[PDB]
């Protein structure tokens, strides 16, 4: 259910594993790609300029993984 | 006979505008002096050739008395140097003697084309002569000029200044009703069998103009004559007994090449809400943003609200975005101009982004209008879903520039449409430019029934088949998929009919001694066609739009607010 | 001294169009104006030079009996300024005076070329005078003006307006039957031998036009004269001057055609027998192309829009072109082929504007099957999916999309794609309202291979002992290209053996000075030897690609369980 995505912006690298929690009954705890991408970017790349590109790439990676 | 209003059709709106502009001044010259108001000096009509602009001017002149002088551009230029100036001056000189009068300059582009198209000296002298004549026309005795040109950019801008051809009328391309009227006018002196319905050909003759329809009628009549001529200052009753038939019209229709296929068509779409029959919230949003501003301006003034410039659709491919835009344009009875993605791609490749200004001028000239941009993301995709740069590009930049320089007083509304709401340039979504995102979800069961019914509206369908069941089990299908199912069923029915006809012909061959085998699209046809059905957009595709709508437009709608 | 219809050849269809257009208005002047119709004010024939369009105009004028007046564009432009307009006015007034009449303006481009070409004041004044005269024919009665130009865009667009030149007839270039007709017309007076088969000559003389064929006939006659030069004209001596097929072949090898590059538009001679396979593909192409021309009423009855086109995909060289030509033949519809190099040339030169010209030509030749040989060529050039900095959209494919969108379904012009790499094709061209149909062309099976072999040997005098049916059985997985290669190798071996045998016979004559053909036909051992030299162009793994593509498309297809109580 979890797949790895690493942020690469401005000559940098990190290690992370995204957790997917879909199929939950409430349908709210189910993962949202954009929320996950923004959370990961802010957690690993806090206050980084031009992070919309990185978030877009992370979203594309999430979509392909899912 | 003398030309008149009833002798011209397909330009009722423009004809009424020209009447409003010109009839009152010429018919009642004394009124203008009393009120001390400025009448028009020159009305410049533009449109593709063959729209009968000369006929419009002739009718307006005849129906208001006055004197009509025609100046043909090619004729003026054909004359020797100096002779052209003499004739051009003499035209205006004489026109006043019979004032009030209307002078029609046909093919103005020939006389005064865009300066960049001119090279010689005497070419510029004639243009200066015409400009000088126009300046003196200001004080002339109720003399008006109506010059016809292909387009506003086809003539020197010096002729478009104040005191000159400053008022413009866009004759444009006739629409279905206009085509029917033109066909009626051209078929007035023709004998036609009852099978012919001009409405069918009018609804079908897309891309034709006034001249082409006359050619179509002539070709149909000549086919009738030739088909009967072989078996036969005329042959008297035999030709007086000539009767055209719908088959002759169809054949002449298939043997004509319309001259305005590539012109941007501006007309009120015939689509209606029942074509989609769903998305009540989207209907309400479109109503609020397109109907009230043009229906209740007083409400917008009473409050400090300013109409929004436009919206932006987004969702799975082929779900009804164009359908919704056309429906909203129909509801307000507003023109509709569509700009497909290939046009934007052509502008990008050819570096012709300057044409966006022309598109917006076209939209402005015909208002209220719903300017619809089908695929704003086409350029973004063409550069990679990336080439290593920002979202900015020349075509979208020009769209932004034109949108910013648009007066909210005009009722031109911009509608976007994309399948990748994330790769769109962020600038176009800024407040003041397309500041709303409307998600067009996959059609629902009721909407699916509506779209199925709309598709089959022109196909004789057996009463046995119930579209509600078909829509029930086709959950997750897009509008394109349902139209595909209908087309497949029609194809199967046609094939069955053809094979049955072949078998009947063979039976006739063996036994030289009859009813329609399959007059309706049988249930079994829809049964087999559904086997070829396939969901176009996967749930993975639905995920992108669902997440986009769940995150954006719902991220921080915290609400839960109330004053003490 | 006067020409007629029988004198003209190679343009039967266009001649019929011209006749139906002009003869009736001219033959019955008063009757025409009595009925509320206007005849063609001006017609514009065009096509590559040398097709004798002037002869067409003269023949029409003679047959209808109308007065004829010829205007030489270069002649008119030769006259010093002022005299040109006077001559034009005199010509038009003279034509009116002897009405009904036809005015044929030859080399119109010279008088009124593209507006960019015109530079001087008099050059534009002449064009303006011509336009004014054109618009002045409405008052005149029964005066039709026909002009000749190479292309519609080679003349001032102001002339092609309404009232002025509006009807256009594309003379084009003659086809095999037309070439045979032209050769028969030209060789009417020449005394020929019994060995000449003008049918075969017309078959070989591809790319020729009337003038080229006339020059070829003159060259053959002069070759015969040269052969008989040493031994006022005596009729019997010229009777002995019997031109032979050898002279015609010599002229063929010596003549330079003037229309080789011109787009060829004619009904292909291919037939389903040439490739007797894929019955399903046959049925699909039939439904797409034949029904909407032979059953127009059915679509209206059921209200269905004919499909605009279809897309092919499969291993290289397996009949993707043969099927298209066969379907065009079945409907007797003209066929236009656009090779991949043409698209590549348009991309490299950024001349995508020519796509409009291709589509215009196809539309003018309705009904017609527009065949694009390689829609993947440009995409493959940019690296394909191996490397693509940009996206699928490109200049030429974008123009194709635009022009297909702008088409009118009433014209019965059907687009057919053809590629070996369907993966990299732009998804835009597969959208509904476009090709919107994918058909997989697989490798030929046994019966198809037998048909292919028979077709490829239909011109080689093969022996009776050859078991083509067996040869197909062992050649499993061979594409049509590979079978043609087998036949080429067999014929190469046979011809080498024949020539070596003739050399041996000559050597025998030399060594022992003092017959029958050693190899009159392709012997079985020739085919046996060639087989050992053969190879399979397409491998099993590269068939797996198309198999997987088709399987992926099919898997999307579901819901085959529509019960519908």
Q: Is B79 annotated as a binding residue?
A: no
Helical axes C446-456 vs C480-511, angle rounded to 10°: 40
Q: Are B27 and B64 in contact (CB under 8 A)?
A: yes
Please report the residues numbered 1 through 30 in chain A whose beta carbons come closer than 8 angstroms to any beta carbon of chain B.
none
Count the Cβ atoms, other than its own, within 10 Å of residue C422.
21
Question: Measuring CA to CA, how many Å separate B452 from each of B29, B443, B484, C76, C484?
Answer: 59, 11, 10, 65, 51
Nearest-angstrom CA–CA distance, B93 and B95: 6
Give the three-state DSSP class for B397: helix
Nearest-angstrom CA–CA distance, B127 and B129: 5
Question: Measuring CA to CA, how many Å separate C556 from each of B534, B535, C550?
Answer: 5, 7, 10
> How far from the centroid of its chain's Cα atoms is residue B512's Cα?
53
Question: Measuring CA to CA, how many Å separate C482 from each of B192, C52, C318?
Answer: 61, 43, 9
The size of chain C, in residues, is 565
Are the beta carbons of B547 and A32 separated by less than 8 Å? Answer: yes
Nearest-angstrom CA–CA distance, B356 and B438: 24
Min Cα distance C385 → chain B (Å) is 12
* Residue partners of A28: CB distance under 8 A and separation at least 6: none
* Residue partners of B85: CB distance under 8 A and separation at least 6: B125, B126, B129
Radius of gyration of chain A (CA): 12
Provide the token pair at B352: 């012709």
* Residue partners of C227: CB distance under 8 A and separation at least 6: C247
Q: Which of C72, C41, C68, C49 is nearest to C57 (CA)?
A: C68
Residue B102: CA count within 13 A, CB half-sphere:
30
Give the three-state DSSP class for B227: helix
**What phi and psi values does residue A46 have, to the nearest 5 degrees?**
-70, 130
- DSSP string over C47-70: -STTS-HHHHHHHHHHHHT-EEEE
Count the Cβ atoms, other than its own, within 10 Å of residue C110.
18
Q: Which of C471, C493, C492 is nearest to C483 (CA)?
A: C471
Q: Which of B406, B272, B259, B266 is nearest to B327 (CA)?
A: B272
> How far from the centroid of its chain's Cα atoms is residue B253's Cα?
21
Please name the residue that has the structure tokens 């046996």.
C528
If you measure CA to CA, which chain A residue comes closest to B544?
A63
Provide the token pair at B149: 């040109």
3-state secondary structure C151-170: CHHHCCHHHHCCCCCCEEEE
Question: Measuring CA to CA, how many Å separate C558 from each of B214, B486, B532?
Answer: 50, 16, 7
Q: Are C423 and C385 in contact (CB under 8 A)?
A: yes
* Residue partners of B47: CB distance under 8 A and separation at least 6: B53, B150, B170, B171, B172, B173
Give the three-state DSSP class for C370: strand
Nearest-angstrom CA–CA distance, C435 and C432: 7
Give the three-state DSSP class for B499: helix
Q: Which of B476, B479, B464 is nearest to B526 (CA)?
A: B464
Resolution (A): 3.1
Are the beta carbons of B547 and A56 separated by less than 8 Å? Answer: no
Q: What angle do CA C484, C486, C489 make, to 5 degrees?
A: 110
Sheet containing B335-339: order of strands: B335-339, B369-373, B412-416, B310-314, B437-439
Q: What is the DSSP letter of B21?
A: I
Are the beta carbons of B551 and A63 separated by less than 8 Å? Answer: no
After what residues is chain C interrupted, C–N > 2.5 A?
231, 514
Are the beta carbons of A59 and B543 separated by less than 8 Å? Answer: no
Nearest-angstrom CA–CA distance, B139 and B143: 9
Cis peptide bond upstream of C367, omega within 30: yes
Count the Cβ atoms, other than its own, within 10 Å of residue B549.
17
Quote the strand ranges of chain A, DSSP E: 3-4, 17-18
Sheet containing C42-46: order of strands: C67-72, C101-106, C143-149, C42-46, C167-170
Nearest-angstrom CA–CA distance, B149 and B132: 20
Nearest-angstrom CA–CA distance, C371 and C376: 13
Residues in A closer than 8 angstroms to B422, CB to CB, are: 56, 59
Q: Which of C61, C45, C20 is nearest to C146 (CA)?
A: C45
Count the Cβ atoms, other than its own, within 10 Å of residue B152.
17
For the stretch C160-193, what's the b/e string if a residue is b when 16 or more beta carbons lie within 10 angstroms of its beta carbon? bbbbbbbbebbbbbbbbebbbbbbebbbeebebe
Nearest-angstrom CA–CA distance, C511 and C278: 59
Nearest-angstrom CA–CA distance, C539 and C93: 73
Question: Measuring CA to CA, how many Å separate B246 from each of B220, B250, B252, B501, C36?
Answer: 9, 6, 10, 23, 18
Element (H, E) at B412: strand B412-416
Provide the token pair at C20: 């139906």
Are the beta carbons of B498 and C135 separated by less than 8 Å? Answer: no
Question: Measuring CA to CA, how many Å separate B186 from each of C24, C85, C162, C465?
Answer: 21, 36, 16, 72
Q: Are B277 and B446 in contact (CB under 8 A)?
A: yes
C16 burial via Cβ count (<10 Å: 0-12, 13-18, 19+)? exposed
* Residue partners of B128: CB distance under 8 A and separation at least 6: none
Residues in A closer than 8 angstroms to B547, CB to CB, are: 32-34
Provide the token pair at C541: 């793994």
Provide the token pair at B485: 């199912």
Residue B463: CA count within 13 A, CB half-sphere:
0
Question: Measuring CA to CA, how many Å separate C194 from each of C48, C109, C229, C243, C245?
Answer: 33, 45, 21, 9, 9
Q: Cα(first)–Cα(last) distance of chain B, in Å?
A: 80
Nearest-angstrom CA–CA distance, C76 and C272: 53
Residues in C closer than 8 angstroms to B495, CB to CB, are: 287, 291
Cis peptide bond upstream of C556, omega within 30: no
If you measure CA to CA, which chain A residue comes closest to B424?
A56
Pinpoint the alpha helices (H) of C79-197: 83-97, 108-111, 121-135, 176-186
Chains that touch A (3 or more CB pairs under 8 A): B
Q: What is the DSSP letter of B50?
A: T
Q: Which of C129, C307, C180 is nearest to B487 (CA)?
A: C307
**What phi and psi values does residue B429 have, to the nearest 5 degrees?**
-95, 5
Quote the strand ranges of C73-199, DSSP E: 101-106, 143-149, 167-170
Count the Cβ atoms, other than its own, within 10 Å of residue C532.
7
Provide the token pair at B113: 């084309």
Q: Is B150 annotated as a binding residue?
A: yes
**What phi and psi values does residue C542 have, to the nearest 5 degrees?**
-80, -10
If you measure CA to CA, which chain A residue comes closest to B539?
A66
Q: What is the DSSP letter of C522?
A: B
Nearest-angstrom CA–CA distance, B398 and B514: 64
Q: Are C65 and C29 in contact (CB under 8 A)?
A: no
> How far from the centroid of its chain's Cα atoms is residue B281's Cα?
28
Provide the token pair at B220: 């149909």
Nearest-angstrom CA–CA distance, C466 and C486: 13
Count the Cβ atoms, other than its own, within 10 Å of residue C318.
28
Nearest-angstrom CA–CA distance, C401 and C49: 32
Radius of gyration of chain B (CA): 29
Nearest-angstrom CA–CA distance, C403 and B489: 28
Nearest-angstrom CA–CA distance, B357 and A4: 47
């Amino acid at each position: 259910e979890a797949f790895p995505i690493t942020l690469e912006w401005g000559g940098r690298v990190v290690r992370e594993t995204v957790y997917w929690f879909q199929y939950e009954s409430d349908s709210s705890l189910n993962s949202n790609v954009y929320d996950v991408a923004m959370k990961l970017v802010t957690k690993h790349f806090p206050g980084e300029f031009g992070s919309e590109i990185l978030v877009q790439k992370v979203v594309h990676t999430i979509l392909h993984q899912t | 006979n003398e030309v008149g209003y009833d002798d011209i059709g397909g330009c009722r709106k423009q004809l009424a505008q020209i009447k409003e502009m010109v009839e009152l001044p010429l018919r009642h010259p004394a009124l203008f002096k009393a009120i001390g108001v400025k009448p028009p000096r020159g009305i410049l009509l533009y449109g593709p050739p063959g729209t009968g602009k000369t006929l419009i001017a002739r009718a307006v002149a005849n129906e208001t008395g006055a004197f009509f002088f025609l100046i043909n551009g090619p004729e003026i230029m054909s004359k020797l140097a100096g002779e052209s100036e003499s004739n051009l001056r003499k035209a205006f000189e004489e026109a006043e003697k019979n004032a009030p009068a209307i002078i029609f300059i046909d093919e103005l582009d020939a006389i005064a084309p865009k300066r960049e198209k001119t090279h010689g000296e005497v070419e510029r002298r004639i243009v200066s002569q015409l400009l000088t004549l126009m300046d003196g026309l200001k004080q002339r005795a109720h003399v008006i000029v109506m010059a016809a040109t292909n387009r506003p950019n086809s003539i020197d801008p010096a002729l478009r200044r104040f005191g000159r051809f400053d008022r413009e009328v866009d004759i444009g391309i006739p629409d279905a009703t206009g085509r029917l009227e033109i066909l009626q006018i051209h078929t007035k002196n023709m004998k036609l069998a009852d099978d012919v319905d001009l409405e069918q050909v009018a609804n079908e003759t897309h891309g034709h103009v006034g001249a082409d329809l006359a050619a179509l009628c002539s070709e149909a009549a000549l086919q009738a004559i030739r088909k009967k001529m072989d078996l036969i200052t005329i042959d008297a009753e035999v030709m007086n007994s000539l009767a055209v038939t719908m088959d002759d019209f169809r054949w002449a229709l298939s043997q004509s090449n319309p001259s305005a296929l590539r012109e941007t068509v501006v007309e009120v779409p015939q689509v209606t809400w029942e074509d989609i029959g769903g998305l009540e919230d989207v209907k309400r949003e479109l109503q609020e943003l397109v109907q009230y501003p043009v229906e209740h301006p007083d409400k917008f003034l009473k409050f400090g609200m300013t109409p929004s410039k436009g919206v932006l659709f987004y969702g799975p491919p082929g779900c009804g975005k164009t359908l919704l835009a056309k429906a909203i344009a129909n509801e307000c009875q507003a023109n509709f101009i569509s700009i497909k993605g290939p046009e934007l791609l052509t502008m990008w490749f050819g570096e012709s982004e300057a044409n966006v200004r022309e598109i917006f001028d076209k939209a402005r000239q015909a208002a209220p209008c719903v300017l619809f941009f089908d695929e704003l993301d086409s350029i973004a995709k063409a550069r990679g879903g990336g080439d290593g740069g920002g979202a900015a590009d020349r075509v979208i930049n020009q769209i932004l520039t034109e949108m910013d320089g648009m007066s909210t007083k005009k009722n031109v509304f911009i509608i976007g449409a994309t399948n990748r709401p994330d790769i769109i340039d962020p600038a176009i979504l800024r407040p003041g430019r397309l500041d709303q995102l409307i998600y067009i979800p996959l059609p629902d069961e009721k909407s699916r029934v509506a779209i199925l019914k709309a598709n089959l509206r022109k196909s004789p369908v057996a009463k046995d088949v119930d579209l509600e069941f078909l829509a029930k089990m086709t959950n997750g299908f897009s509008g394109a998929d349902l139209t595909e199912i209908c087309q497949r069923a029609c194809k199967l029915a046609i094939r069955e009919s053809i094979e049955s006809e072949i078998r009947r012909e063979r039976e006739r061959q063996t036994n030289p001694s009859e009813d329609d085998p399959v007059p309706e699209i049988r249930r079994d046809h829809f049964e087999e066609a559904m086997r070829f059905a396939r969901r176009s957009v996967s749930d993975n595709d639905i995920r992108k739009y669902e997440m986009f709508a769940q995150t954006l437009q719902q991220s921080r709608g915290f609400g839960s607010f109330r004053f003490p």
